[PDB]
Amino acid sequence: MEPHDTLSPAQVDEYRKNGFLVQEHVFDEEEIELLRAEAAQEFASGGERVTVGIVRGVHGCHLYSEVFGRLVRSPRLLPIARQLLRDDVYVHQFKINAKRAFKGEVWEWHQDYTFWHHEDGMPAPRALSAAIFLDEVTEFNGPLTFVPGGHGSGMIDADVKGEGWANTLTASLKYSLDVETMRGLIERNGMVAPKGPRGSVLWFDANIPHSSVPNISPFDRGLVLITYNSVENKTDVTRGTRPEWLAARDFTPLTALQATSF
Amino acid sequence: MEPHDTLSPAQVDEYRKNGFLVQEHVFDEEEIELLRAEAAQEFASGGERVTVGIVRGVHGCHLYSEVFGRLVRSPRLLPIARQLLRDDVYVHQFKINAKRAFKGEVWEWHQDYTFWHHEDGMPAPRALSAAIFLDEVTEFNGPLTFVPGGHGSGMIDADVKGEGWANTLTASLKYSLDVETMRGLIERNGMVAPKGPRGSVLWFDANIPHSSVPNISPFDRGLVLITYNSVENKTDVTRGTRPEWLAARDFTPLTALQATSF
Ligand SMILES: O=C(O)[C@H]1NCC[C@@H]1O
Numbered sequence: 391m392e393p394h395d396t397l398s399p400a401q402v403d404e405y406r407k408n409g410f411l412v413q414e415h416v417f418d419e420e421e422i423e424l425l426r427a428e429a430a431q432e433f434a435s436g437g438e439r440v441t442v443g444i445v446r447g448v449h450g451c452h453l454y455s456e457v458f459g460r461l462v463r464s465p466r467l468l469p470i471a472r473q474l475l476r477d478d479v480y481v482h483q484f485k486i487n488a489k490r491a492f493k494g495e496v497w498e499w500h501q502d503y504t505f506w507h508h509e510d511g512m513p514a515p516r517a518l519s520a521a522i523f524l525d526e527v528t529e530f531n532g533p534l535t536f537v538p539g540g541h542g543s544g545m546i547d548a549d550v551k552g553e554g555w556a557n558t559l560t561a562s563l564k565y566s567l568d569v570e571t572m573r574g575l576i577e578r579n580g581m582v583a584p585k586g587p588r589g590s591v592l593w594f595d596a597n598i599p600h601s602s603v604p605n606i607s608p609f610d611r612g613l614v615l616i617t618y619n620s621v622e623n624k625t626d627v628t629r630g631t632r633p634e635w636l637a638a639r640d641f642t643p644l645t646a647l648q649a650t651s652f
Numbered sequence: 653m654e655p656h657d658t659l660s661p662a663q664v665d666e667y668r669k670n671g672f673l674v675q676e677h678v679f680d681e682e683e684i685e686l687l688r689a690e691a692a693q694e695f696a697s698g699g700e701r702v703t704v705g706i707v708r709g710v711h712g713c714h715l716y717s718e719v720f721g722r723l724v725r726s727p728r729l730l731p732i733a734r735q736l737l738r739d740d741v742y743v744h745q746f747k748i749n750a751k752r753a754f755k756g757e758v759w760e761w762h763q764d765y766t767f768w769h770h771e772d773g774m775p776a777p778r779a780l781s782a783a784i785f786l787d788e789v790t791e792f793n794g795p796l797t798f799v800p801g802g803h804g805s806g807m808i809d810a811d812v813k814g815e816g817w818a819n820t821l822t823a824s825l826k827y828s829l830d831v832e833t834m835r836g837l838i839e840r841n842g843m844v845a846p847k848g849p850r851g852s853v854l855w856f857d858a859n860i861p862h863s864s865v866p867n868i869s870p871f872d873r874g875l876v877l878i879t880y881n882s883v884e885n886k887t888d889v890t891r892g893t894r895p896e897w898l899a900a901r902d903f904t905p906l907t908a909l910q911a912t913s914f
């Protein structure tokens with residue numbers, strides 16, 4: 391194992407100003423293939439934790455998979471999440487999202503924090519997601535798309551639908567940011583679909599508004615998304631509506647994987 | 653009126669090599685607003701020529717609208733189409749396609765020539781379309797997307813659906829290029845979504861494979877598309893299945909608008 395990875399001051403400034411940031415080539419192909427293979431196994435035996443008719447999402451895999459439980463403690467990831475949240479951290483949510491070639495949905499503009507505040511009891515937006523690129527993310531395979539700086543407009547009052555947590559997981563969403571709001575935000579800030587090669591990591595703020603469109607390429611777009619939360623900002627488990635595999639309840643501070651002979 | 657517009661040798665080379673080409677800022681805002689206003693009138697009274705539940709397409713407007721009949725003979729357009737097709741030309745098809753803000757469909761990969769050969773009797777791919785930008789075309793408002801150089805692989809054998817011309821106009825298409833074909837083409841050539849400001853013109857070859865995704869922006873994307881065909885390559889009206897407003901039958905060579913006091 392190396393020195394723990396840190397963002398440079400420039401990277402940090404870029405992250406806070408925009409609310410997202412791509413580090414290119416964090417993992418190699420061999421590491422990425424190990425993650426691809428484990429993701430396929432979870433898609434195949436995830437059960438109620440899966441989302442679809444062909445499988446498209448799985449939730450909570452770091453609680454059940456040894457590979458994924460080590461991934462979240464990796465020295466390429468955990469220290470940056472400590473650095474950005476300025477705290478010890480733990481994993482609130484883990485999920486894999488594949489958009490297969492010539493497939494996919496329009497994911498309505500939204501803020502993760504909005505769901506986590508109302509569904510899970512997250513007190514403050516002191517959280518972020520790391521989306522590992524299992525495939526090259528381009529213009530055409532349905533990249534996550536953001537309003538840069540749009541996290542600074544706090545949580546935005548949103549159109550609310552559904553009952554329970556049934557449509558938290560699906561592309562028609564329970565909390566969709568208004569059309570009139572979006573225009574203002576976008577007139578003001580613009581739109582960015584960060585791109586990069588396989589093995590890249592895209593860090594994004596819990597309150598950044600984001601969306602994506604379908605994949606019109608012949609290449610799949612697999613993403614592993616790890617949502618780190620600050621231990622100080624642990625969710626209020628008394629207001630909690632959802633289960634462990636969507637919203638974690640073990641708030642033990644994580645420590646990084648140590649170098650071992652196995 | 654000016655000297656007639658021509659592409660530079662570089663532009664022409666770029667067009668033939670890639671099969672598409674954007675000229676920026678061909679029309680001003682005032683010209684574009686005249687076209688917007690006329691398009692709204694056609695969307696409202698086009699009748700059977702319209703396509704939808706909210707209006708999204710209209711076909712054949714240059715046969716019914718004085719503004720649109722002059723547009724096709726404009727010295728910003730007609731001479732480039734002469735230049736690229738190396739012939740006198742006429743309009744085979746005219747259509748307006750709006751993708752409203754937060755709206756739109758995935759348009760499956762396709763080749764226009766494939767439809768025009770089989771539906772209308774077009775002997776050779778000696779045709780092209782000029783798509784005038786009524787709005788700024790960006791990454792996020794569903795730009796027409798192309799395989800550069802993909803016109804040189806001739807007409808590609810395609811999956812065929814429907815009966816009649818019912819699903820020629822709609823986003824699930826009668827002639828959809830295969831998934832396996834596309835991957836090969838794309839592995840080989842890549843993908844480009846030409847962009848530009850309002851009043852731009854995007855010229856593209858009749859055989860270039862193209863597609864688009866929905867508009868996830870708060871801005872509309874209106875396009876006027878004029879399909880010029882070579883007079884020598886006029887359609888065989890004996891194999892013709894569709895009506896005047898989809899496939900024209902007056903093959904008179906066009907001449908440009910002359911400067912008049914009105
Ligand atoms: O509902 C959730 O918790 C997740 N799915 C969409 C928004 C979050 O990422």
Ligand SMILES: O=C(O)[C@H]1NCC[C@@H]1O
Binds near residue numbers: 762763764767820821
């Ligand atoms: O069917 C047509 O003739 C037109 N619509 C889709 C392909 C062409 O542009």
